[PDB]
Ligand binder design. Structure first.
Ligand SMILES: Nc1ncnc2c1ncn2[C@@H]1O[C@H](COP(=O)(O)OP(N)(=O)O)[C@@H](O)[C@H]1O
Length: 386
């Protein structure tokens, strides 16, 4: 009877429930409204979510993330070959051509298919909802990117089944974000909706049309390797160079643990810069026992990321061209993904759309789970959100 909506994200996942027409995004054990899509294996335990992400730099080989980039893919795909440079964990091809993620767990070599790793994240999101409701949850709607093919969708459904969920439906992420804002209900006329989704690792722009409660994905574009992690890397590259100029050419980049610790602090400073004009990046005993400290203004962060930020408009122009429409014909621009909190990005989109205010009332990293939760309630017989 109880049905949840789950955004199974590349970097972060989110769970929501829609009851009585109202949507509650459920916080985890640490009070976090989103949970890292991370699974780690140690000498004693299997960690999922925050606990797994928090020990990633101390256990890189056995901390799995990015399974969404592998789910439903053949190991031989050029996407896998290219992405694997970014992973400290080992991925090999099985005899069936499916990827096998190799880790050490309790002193033993273990292998997992991408959907087994995703099933563990889904099981954690199921448990987050169960703790909140105080009751078992069996039904769920899971979202996937619009471009996911049949193999990727089926593998995501299989991940749900393995996690103990009865997957009522797999729906598109941009469509879920649009449903969250009630854009299917408010206004009977045809509506052209642009979903601008900039997360931790990917950038997806989708142009939808809504006529009479029916959403159709007219055009999609983006960049599978542009997200918040790339803005963190801009700060890391700067700090590495700044450390060199301060400490007689010493190179932090030679130590991968020093880089990971610096990256952690660069992402924290980046988030602060979304609501403050300045932030401090500080790592005590970063490299060679030398403490590192630097102050980054929002202006300097904007300068380091200038091309990357402006280039987010290129896939916006591409979807409008593919759909044969002018930017003036877009009725609503919905900001999705944690990176859409960056003021410069919001200003760039607003200027592009000639001063139109984007829909950002829903926490952008929760809008997809919010829409999935609405759809889960509808598919369960609850018409209260309408
Ligand atoms: N306040 C903020 N300012 C800038 N970036 C922020 C932010 N809050 C979250 N983010 C970024 O959002 C990204 C994750 O977005 P999210 O939408 O949860 O991840 P995803 N692609 O798995 O679905 C991370 O790179 C994180 O640094």
């Amino acid at each position: 009877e109880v049905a949840i909506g789950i955004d199974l994200g590349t970097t972060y996942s989110c769970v929501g429930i829609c009851r009585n027409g109202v949507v509650d995004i459920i916080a985890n054990d640490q009070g976090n409204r989103t949970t890292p899509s991370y699974v780690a294996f140690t000498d004693t335990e299997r960690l999922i979510g925050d606990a797994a992400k928090n020990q990633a730099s101390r256990n890189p080989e056995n901390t799995v993330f990015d399974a969404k980039r592998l789910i439903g893919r053949k190991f031989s795909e050029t996407t896998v070959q290219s992405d694997m440079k970014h992973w400290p964990f080992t991925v090999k091809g099985g005899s069936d051509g499916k990827p096998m993620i190799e880790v050490s767990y309790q002193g033993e070599k273990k292998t997992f298919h991408p959907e087994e790793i995703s099933s563990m994240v889904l099981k954690k999101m199921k448990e987050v909802a169960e703790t909140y409701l105080g009751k078992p949850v069996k039904n769920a709607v899971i979202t996937v990117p619009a471009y996911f093919n049949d193999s990727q969708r089926q593998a995501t459904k299989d991940a749900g089944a393995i996690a103990g969920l009865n997957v009522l439906r797999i729906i598109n992420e941009p469509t879920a974000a649009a449903i969250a804002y009630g854009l299917d209900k408010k206004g009977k006329g045809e509506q052209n909706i642009l979903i601008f989704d900039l997360g931790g690792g990917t950038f997806d722009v989708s142009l939808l049309t809504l006529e009479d409660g029916i959403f159709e994905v007219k055009a999609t574009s983006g960049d599978t390797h542009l997200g918040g992690e790339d803005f963190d890397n801009k700060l890391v590259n700067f700090c590495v160079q700044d450390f060199k100029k301060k400490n007689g050419g010493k190179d932090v980049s030679k130590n991968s643990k020093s880089l990971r610790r610096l990256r952690t602090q660069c992402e924290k400073a980046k988030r602060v810069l979304s609501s403050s004009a300045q932030a401090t990046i500080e790592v005590d005993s970063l490299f060679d026992g030398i403490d590192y400290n630097v102050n980054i203004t929002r202006a300097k962060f904007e300068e380091l990321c200038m091309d990357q930020f402006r280039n987010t408009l290129i896939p916006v122009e591409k979807v409008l061209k593919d759909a044969k429409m002018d930017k003036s014909q877009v009725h609503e621009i919905v900001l999705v993904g944690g990176s859409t909190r960056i003021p410069k990005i919001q200003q760039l989109i607003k200027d592009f759309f000639n001063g139109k205010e984007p829909c950002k009332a829903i926490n952008p990293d929760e809008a997809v789970a919010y829409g999935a939760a609405v759809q889960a309630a509808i598919l369960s017989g609850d018409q209260s959100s309408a």
